[PDB]
């Protein structure tokens, strides 16, 4: 979903935590009308978006080849990779990497950043956590 007059202008990952063996990240964002959100996301949420984005924008993902055989220029940011066993030290580094990743996303060209797809990660979910604050 997109809301006219309320588009993403800033995003961050501020912290991580553990609840019953599962690590989570605090994602914050600011909208163009000055509203902000505090959100809870798991690594998988970022991974699932990234899979969607690389598929939806193959050229910008560096996944296309021209007639000459040269790969298209990549402007899409990278996510930290999936791991067989999640640990505190892996999660700590992910928090740092994901912070940069989400800021980079919201700054992509309009035709990518303003997409339902990119905005989907930042929607308030009925997950017993996510909240939107007035300006």
Curated annotation (Swiss-Prot):
It comes from the Eukaryota. Coiled coil: none annotated. It is found in: Cytoplasm, Cytoskeleton. Residues 3-129 form the PX domain. Interacts with AXL2 and BUD5. Necessary for cell polarization during vegetative growth. May link the cytoskeleton to morphogenic determinants on the cell surface. Present with 6490 molecules/cell in log phase SD medium. This is Bud emergence protein 1. The lineage of its organism: Eukaryota, Fungi, Dikarya, Ascomycota, Saccharomycotina. The chain holds residues 276 to 410 of 551 of the full protein.
């Amino acid at each position: 979903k997109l809301v006219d007059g309320e588009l993403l202008v800033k995003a961050s990952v501020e912290s991580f935590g553990l609840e019953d063996e599962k690590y989570w990240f605090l994602v914050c964002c600011e909208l163009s009308n000055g509203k902000t959100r505090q959100l809870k996301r798991y690594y998988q949420d970022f991974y699932d978006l990234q899979v969607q984005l690389l598929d939806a924008f193959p050229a910008e993902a560096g996944k296309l080849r021209d007639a000459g055989g040269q790969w298209s220029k990549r402007i899409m940011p990278y996510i930290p990779g999936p791991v067989p066993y999640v640990t505190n030290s892996i999660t700590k580094k992910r928090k740092e990497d994901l912070n940069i990743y989400v800021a980079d996303l919201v700054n992509l060209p309009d035709y990518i950043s303003r997409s339902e797809m990119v905005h989907s990660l930042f929607v308030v979910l009925n997950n017993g956590f996510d909240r939107e604050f007035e300006r």
